Amino acid sequence: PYMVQPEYRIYEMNKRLQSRTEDSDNLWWDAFATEFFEDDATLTLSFCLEDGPKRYTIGRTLIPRYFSTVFEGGVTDLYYILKHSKESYHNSSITVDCDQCAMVTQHGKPMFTKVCTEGRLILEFTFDDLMRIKTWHFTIRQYRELVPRSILAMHAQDPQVLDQLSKNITRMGLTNF
Amino acid sequence: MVQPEYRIYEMNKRLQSRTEDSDNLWWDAFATEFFEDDATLTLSFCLEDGPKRYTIGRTLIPRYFSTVFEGGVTDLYYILKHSKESYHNSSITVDCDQCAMVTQHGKPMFTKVCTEGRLILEFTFDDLMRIKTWHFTIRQYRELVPRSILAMHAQDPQVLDQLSKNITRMG
């Protein structure tokens, strides 16, 4: 009766990523993959290095493992910004071809780094009622680790920062790290 | 099954089509697309002296958004997290306690600025679904700088070139 256009599917995927928790198990990730990918889908990461092109292709089975992995090291947020996508409708598929795609991951402590991985993202959807990704190909061109700067001078005098210093010397020694 | 939060995704997409040469007329069409003819926009702070509220009238709403692009900014988008949607007579409320306004700067710092807080949006329950009120309570602010990832970046001859250009501007 209706049909989701493909950019709404991606907003859905960002929204679903936002409800992941530190308690989300592997079954939650399996359902994430079942929601958005096809049963035979693949996910490819591509780099152009001095040695030549580097392909990393993940089968459908490990697509859930991949997303769980991106979250592993204290990550709290992951989302996708697609800038100026081009859609092309085919007989049985739609392709979303984004030249400026940014994958954003927010880290927690101690750095609270915002990581931006940017490149070309090619998405092949099925012209389906379900509208799931059949191929995900991400060619990485650019990478940034953004660190919050200390905005005010008095921040370097915060007694909580100095306590963190003193709490190291309490648990470890002064001659000890 | 109507989905009001996506209206802001569309705003994000629409903002991306802004160019370095986007008119005042362009921003007036932007405002007309997403805001009612009588909308207001309010930013709020809780400060040492009490609530401070800044409210913009509809005619000043396009100039709000283009001002955000005046410092050499290249991107502006909104990230809404765990929004609660509410349906009234003729209105829908979108209340997001984790709204992030993200702006990308250009040279020399290439900063990414994240302004975060509570965003409340009142939409008309009609076919255009345009914003009646936009109320943003700013609770958190971060200026993120790209770090230098590799030690050899400090020896880059283009970095030394800009230094050399500087000393020329001295005598």
- Residue B92 maps to which CATH number? 3.10.450.50
Domain membership of residue A138 (yes or no) is yes
Residue contact A146–B144, C-beta within 8 A: yes
Residue B111, SS3? coil
Residue type, A57: T
Residue environment code for A90-107, b if the CB has 16+ CB neighbours within 10 A, otherwise e: eeeebbbbbebbbbbbbb
Residues of chain A with Cβ-Cβ distance to B5 below 8 Å are 15
Element of type H or E holding A50: none
Residue A26, SS3? helix
Domain membership of residue B154 (yes or no) is yes
| Rounded distance between C-alpha atoms, residue A140 and residue A147, angstroms | 21
For CA atoms B156, B157, B162, B168, give the dihedral sign.
Answer: positive
Distance from CA of A83 to the nearest CA of B (A): 7
Specify which residues B95 forms β-bridges with. Answer: B84, B120
Q: Which domain holds residue A125?
A: 6-151
The DSSP symbol for A175 reads T
Domain membership of residue B48 (yes or no) is yes
Residue contact A145–B149, C-beta within 8 A: yes
Domain membership of residue B21 (yes or no) is yes
Contact A105, A73 (CB under 8 A): no
Residues of chain B with Cβ-Cβ distance to A79 below 8 Å are 79
Total domains present in chain B: 1
Contacts 24+ apart (CB under 8 A), A23-27: A26/A64, A26/A68
Structure determination method: X-ray
Q: Both tokens of residue B76? A: 């502006």
Domain membership of residue B85 (yes or no) is yes
Q: Of how many residues is chain B composed?
A: 171
φ/ψ of residue B143, rounded to 5: -110, 110
Beta strands in chain B (DSSP E): 35-47, 50-57, 75-81, 84-88, 91-104, 112-124, 131-146
- Alpha-carbon B102 to chain mean position: 6
Beta strands in A59-172 (DSSP E): 75-89, 93-107, 114-126, 133-148
Domain membership of residue B1 (yes or no) is no
A42 Cβ neighbours under 8 A, 6+ residues apart: A57, A58, A59, A60, A63, A135, A136
Residue B90, SS3? coil
Across the interface, of A7, A18, A145, the residue whose CB is closest to B146 is A145
Domain membership of residue A156 (yes or no) is no
Instruction: Give the N- to C-terminal CA distance of chain B in Å, as an integer.
Output: 69
- Alpha-carbon A129 to chain mean position: 26
Residue A10, SS3? helix
Residue type, A119: G
Residue environment code for B24-53, b if the CB has 16+ CB neighbours within 10 A, otherwise e: eeebeebbeebbbeebbbebbeeeeeeeee
Q: Select from B65, B73, B58, B79 the least CA-distant residue to B27.
A: B65
CA dihedral (A150, B96, A105, A98) in degrees, to 10, reads: -120
The DSSP symbol for A109 reads T
Q: How many CB atoms lie within 10 A of CB B14?
A: 13
| Rounded distance between C-alpha atoms, residue B19 and residue B36, angstroms | 24
Q: Both tokens of residue A1? A: 């009766």
Q: What is the resolution of this structure in A?
A: 2.3
Domain membership of residue A162 (yes or no) is no
Element of type H or E holding A48: strand A37-49
| Rounded distance between C-alpha atoms, residue A151 and residue A154, angstroms | 9
Closest chain B CA to residue A15:
B81
What angle separates helix A63-70 from helix A26-36, to the nearest 10 degrees?
120
To test the contact with chain A by mutation, choose from B145, B148, B149, B153 the residue with the greatest count of A C-beta atoms within 10 A, namely B145
B19 Cβ neighbours under 8 A, 6+ residues apart: none
Specify which residues B104 forms β-bridges with. Answer: B75, B112
| Rounded distance between C-alpha atoms, residue A35 and residue A130, angstroms | 8
